[PDB]
Amino acid sequence: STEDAMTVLTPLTEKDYEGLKRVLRSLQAHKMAWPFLEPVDPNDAPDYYGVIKEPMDLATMEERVQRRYYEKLTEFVADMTKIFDNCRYYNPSDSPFYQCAEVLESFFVQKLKGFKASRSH
C-alpha cells in the first residue's frame, strides 16, 4: 500500500522507471562495461552457450526496461546479478572480463543504493 515502506518487493511504477533507466545508462557508459554491453558473441567463445544456461547482458536489460518487464526491484537486481555471476562462472578470476565484473558490480551497488534512497510511492 501507499502507507507501507519501500522495499525490493514494492511494485515498480512508470515513475520508478526514470530511476531504473538512469542506473542502467550509468552502467552502459562505464568504461569497464564493454564485456557486458551486448550478448556474448559465440565466435568469441564457442563453448559459451553450452555452459551458461541463462545468458544476460545490458542490451537485453535495456530492451526489458523499455518493455516495463520488471514488476519489482528484485527482478531487475536478479537480471543484473546474472550478468556478473555468469561472467564469474565462465571465466577465471584473472580474466579481464572477470575484473570488469568486479568493478561494475560494486558500481551497480553504489548506484542502486542511490536509487533506493531516492524512492517514494
Ligand SMILES: COc1cc(-c2cn(C)c(=O)c(C)c2C)ccc1C1(N2CCN(C)CC2)CC1
Ligand atoms: C574479447 O572481446 C569481447 C569479449 C566479450 C565477452 C564477455 N563476457 C562477459 C564473457 O564472459 C566472454 C566469454 C566474452 C568473450 C564481450 C565483448 C568483447 C568485445 N568484442 C570482441 C569481438 N567480438 C566480435 C565483438 C565483441 C567488445 C570487445
